[PDB]
């Protein structure tokens, strides 16, 4: 896309060691699946396109971007070593939204609905085996 958007977060890197865990499997099959199909998922399914949105300050403010399209690729392409790395990606995505936008803006209400679901699912993250 535009040269004025940063490159997306890394989803491929052979030098980074990879592992499947049961918790990572749950993150894809339960957590990502649940949030991706939610009515309010669409703004979170790809990197913020600051050019298309006319938000030229977005990447001035948000220096650690994350989105569910990136997370989906990371899960499907086994990028992670553990569940904490992926959970941190989700939390980064939510916090970016809460930092950039005014409380009570529609996008914040959308994020909060996804976060409530996320929390419920992560409370049930299975014991690592």
Ligand X SMILES: O=c1cc(Br)ccn1CCO
Tell me how far, at minimum, the Cβ of 25 lies from ligand X, in Å: 25
Place of tokens 């992926």: 86
Query: 94: which residues sit within 8 A by CB, 6+ positions away?
Result: 111, 114, 115, 118
Binder of ligand X out of 27, 31, 87, 97 (CB under 6 A): 97
CA nearest 66: which of 80, 45, 83? 45
Question: CB of 31: closest distance to ligand X in angstroms?
Answer: 17
Shortest separation between residue 99's beta carbon and ligand X, angstroms: 9
Report the distance separating Cα 34 and Cα 21, nearest Å.
19
Q: Binding ligand X by CB under 6 A: which of 81, 101, 122, 125?
A: 101
Contact positions vs ligand X (CB under 6 A): 43-44, 48, 53, 55, 97, 100-101, 107
């Amino acid at each position: 896309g535009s040269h004025m958007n940063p490159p997306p977060p890394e989803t491929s890197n052979p030098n980074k060691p990879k592992r499947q865990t049961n918790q990572l499997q749950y993150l894809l099959r339960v957590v990502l699946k649940t949030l991706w199909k939610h009515q309010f998922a669409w703004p979170f399914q790809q990197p913020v396109d600051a050019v298309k949105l006319n938000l030229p300050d977005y990447y001035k403010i948000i220096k650690t971007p994350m989105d569910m399209g990136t997370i989906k690729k990371r899960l499907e392409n086994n990028y992670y070593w553990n569940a904490q790395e992926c959970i941190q990606d989700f939390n980064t995505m939510f916090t970016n939204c809460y930092i950039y936008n005014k409380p009570g803006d529609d996008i914040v209400l959308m994020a909060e609905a996804l976060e409530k679901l996320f929390l419920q699912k992560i409370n049930e993250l299975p014991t690592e085996e």
